[PDB]
Design a protein around this ligand. Structure first.
Ligand code: NA
Ligand code: NA
Ligand code: NA
Length: 411
């Protein structure tokens, strides 16, 4: 015999804003499932992965948990680290999602989590400065280059079409190489980067070409824009740095620091002639997953479904985790006015979802050691320690060593 009630545990992280709405959502869940209880185990980001790690190791994790995309390779290299969500297809309306984004959270045939929202880096431009320069936004890569020189001569040496940190520049070039070559960037199975030597040379050649054309400040100005914070620097506020390439889901920071009436507007995504693939880096912002060892996979799956697809759950959660991916979810929030097509974040996402997106991405491309190394490599170019060639060989070699380490055996 079993019991009158089912007891579930769920974990998530965030600020009080996120806590409040999910707490709310759990009351609504319990109203519809009065014999399913939920113990809410939540904290801020700091310390979270560490607590969950030690729980997951000893089979003590919650039934349902908010997870990060890059946790898949940590706890689920062979795809069995979390419960296979295809097995609770009956409780969990998978029809509300698409294969493109479900594939990112599938590992060795197993649906390891449901992406709550997705985001990708795209271009946003300052309309006032581009008006001053007398330019339309770039539709091609060469137009982006061409813009650099117009910005320099027609407005000044302090004006740039965009401002980019190392990480953005890395994702951006990757995007260009994907358009040109249609090859994957990380060779997953062999724990190494996939490009050939020539292509790494090309990669950095591209970086040099962008800088030489005044597309964005080089790393000699790294003292200036080298911040998870440069949307507060004067060049940003004043429209000197006239655009960025950035996750659509985190553009409001930049948008809000512009001296109005200047606005930050969605740009085209530049394409090579007859590219079959735009090469965006799509990234699920977070996921709901089910504990591998849950005694209640069905009820766990009901909770996830309720938070993501139900009217009440959807209404309560709002945008506290980004713009929902669930089709019923976004239809609901559009009708309620919560999601506004004119919001730069939503317009960018919409455009992004619609660009050709053949090639797929590895969580290891966003590894911070990798990003840190790319910053090193471009400075060696800007400060004259290495030619493009030498830098390329360097990045390929050290890049491989950082990967093998991060994908097992570190040490
Ligand atoms: Na019993
Ligand atoms: Na292509
Ligand atoms: Na929602």
């Amino acid at each position: 015999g079993s019991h009158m009630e089912v007891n579930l545990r769920m974990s998530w992280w965030g600020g009080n804003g996120r806590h409040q709405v999910t707490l709310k959502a759990l009351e609504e869940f319990h109203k519809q499932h009065p014999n399913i209880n939920v113990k809410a185990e939540y904290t801020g980001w700091d310390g979270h992965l560490s607590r969950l790690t030690t729980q997951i190791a000893g089979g003590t994790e919650p039934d349902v948990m908010q997870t990060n995309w890059n946790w898949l390779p940590i706890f689920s290299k062979d795809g069995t680290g979390f419960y296979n969500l295809f097995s609770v297809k009956e409780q969990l309306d998978l029809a509300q999602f698409d294969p493109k984004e479900l594939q990112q959270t599938t590992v060795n045939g197993k649906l390891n989590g449901i992406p709550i929202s997705v985001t990708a880096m795209i271009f946003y431009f300052n309309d006032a400065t581009w008006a001053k320069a007398g330019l339309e936004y770039p539709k091609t890569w060469d137009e982006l280059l061409a813009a650099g020189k117009v910005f320099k001569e027609k407005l000044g040496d302090q004006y740039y079409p965009v401002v980019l940190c190392a990480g953005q520049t890395l994702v951006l070039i990757r995007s260009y190489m994907t358009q040109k070559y249609n090859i994957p960037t990380i060779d997953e199975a062999n724990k190494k980067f996939a490009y050939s030597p020539e292509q790494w040379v090309e990669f950095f050649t591209m970086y040099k070409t962008m800088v030489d054309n005044h597309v964005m400040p080089s790393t000699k100005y790294y003292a200036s824009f080298g911040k998870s914070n440069h949307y507060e620097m004067k060049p940003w506020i004043n429209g000197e740095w006239a655009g960025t390439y950035m996750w659509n889901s985190t553009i409001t920071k930049y948008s809000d620091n512009l001296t109005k009436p200047a606005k930050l507007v969605l740009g085209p995504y530049p394409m090579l002639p007859g590219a079959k693939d735009a090469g965006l880096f799509f990234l699920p912002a977070q996921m709901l997953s089910i504990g591998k060892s849950t005694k209640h996979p069905q009820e766990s799956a009901m909770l996830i479904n309720f938070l993501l697809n139900s009217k009440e759950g959807v209404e309560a959660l709002g945008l506290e985790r980004g713009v929902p991916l669930s089709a019923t979810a976004v239809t609901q929030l559009r009708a309620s006015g919560v999601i506004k097509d004119e919001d730069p974040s939503v317009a960018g996402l919409n455009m992004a979802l619609e660009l050709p997106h053949k090639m797929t991405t590895s969580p290891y491309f966003l590894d911070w050691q990798i990003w840190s190394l790319f910053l090193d490599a471009i400075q060696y170019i800007d400060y004259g320690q290495k030619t493009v060639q030498e830098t390329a060989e360097y990045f390929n070699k050290q890049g491989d060593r950082i990967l093998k380490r991060a994908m097992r055996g570190s040490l």
